């Protein structure tokens, strides 16, 4: 169906400690496939997916010249930014930047996006039409100007609807078994005791992909919510994801409960019933 390749870039100044560190990481949905890290002995963009592995030199050469480029342009923005805000030397700062394009259930493009932020704060994002910017912040127009002007949103608008989607499809193919297939959620249930009157009931979901997913409790067919701990969907560490939703329950009433699970990798959504 729908997919999305998008990039993450993060340079972080470290005064005195030589040059700032730069990191680039690529994803197609929730599958990492390339990376960069000025501190690694690689000094080259690296493959993290079997399907990108099968790209000849032309690829890895280019991706390094470009990450390198990115690696550098941010390196400066870091101080240029520090200027726009006039900040002392002693003290680190972080410049982030993400961009990617998505595609509908037809691989013919859904939308493109390009955002920037200085010090974990929105700096300038590209409006949804991809022809205008949003410089939420005053001396953030200094960049908005240099860009809405120099015509970046123009040849960038060409990348998003162009190359971006094109390569997204090329990857989608080379990685059919990995990218286009799912890993249903293996699920179970734990029951920890809280005390004489209460006892927690936790509904697990491990080894699944995409990381997208929902988890809910239905005591007698009455969904619960605010009183339900809900850990963020966490990385299993092998490509799959796990997540659990637990709820404090009246000791001796567990049977009333049923866990509800939704996941693209499940035909019908499963309704796990604690006491069958």
């Amino acid at each position: 169906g729908s997919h999305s390749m998008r990039y993450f870039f993060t340079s972080v100044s470290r005064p005195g400690r030589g040059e700032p560190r730069f990191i680039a990481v690529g994803y197609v949905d929730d599958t990492q496939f390339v990376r960069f890290d000025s501190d690694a002995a690689s000094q080259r963009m690296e493959p993290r997916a079997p399907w990108i592995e099968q790209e000849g030199p032309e690829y890895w050469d280019g991706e390094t010249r470009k990450v390198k480029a990115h690696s550098q342009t941010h390196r400066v923005d870091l101080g240029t930014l520090r200027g726009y805000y006039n900040q002392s030397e002693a003290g680190s700062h972080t410049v982030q930047r993400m961009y990617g394009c998505d595609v509908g259930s037809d691989w013919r493009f859904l939308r493109g996006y390009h955002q920037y932020a200085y010090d974990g704060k929105d700096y300038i994002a590209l409006k949804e039409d991809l022809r205008s910017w949003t410089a939420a912040d005053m001396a953030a127009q200094t960049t908005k100007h240099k860009w809405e002007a120099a015509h970046v949103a123009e040849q960038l608008r060409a990348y998003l609807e162009g190359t971006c989607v094109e390569w997204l499809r090329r990857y989608l193919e080379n990685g059919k078994e990995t990218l286009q297939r799912t890993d249903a959620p293996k699920t179970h249930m734990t029951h920890h005791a809280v005390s004489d009157h209460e006892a927690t009931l936790r509904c697990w979901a491990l080894s699944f992909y995409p990381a997208e997913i929902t988890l809910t409790w239905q005591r007698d067919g009455e969904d619960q919510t605010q009183d339900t701990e809900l850990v963020e969907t966490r990385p299993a560490g092998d490509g799959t994801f796990q997540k659990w939703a637990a709820v404090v329950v009246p000791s001796g009433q567990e049977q009333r409960y049923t866990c509800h699970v939704q996941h693209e990798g499940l035909p019908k959504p499963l309704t796990l019933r604690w006491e069958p």
């Binding site: 990039y7 990450v67 480029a69 941010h74 726009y84 200085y118 120099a150 960038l156 971006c164």
Partner: peptide, 9 residues
């Protein structure tokens, strides 16, 4: 692949 060129803020 990667967009290019990338621009300074």
């Amino acid at each position: 692949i990667l967009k290019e060129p990338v621009h300074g803020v």
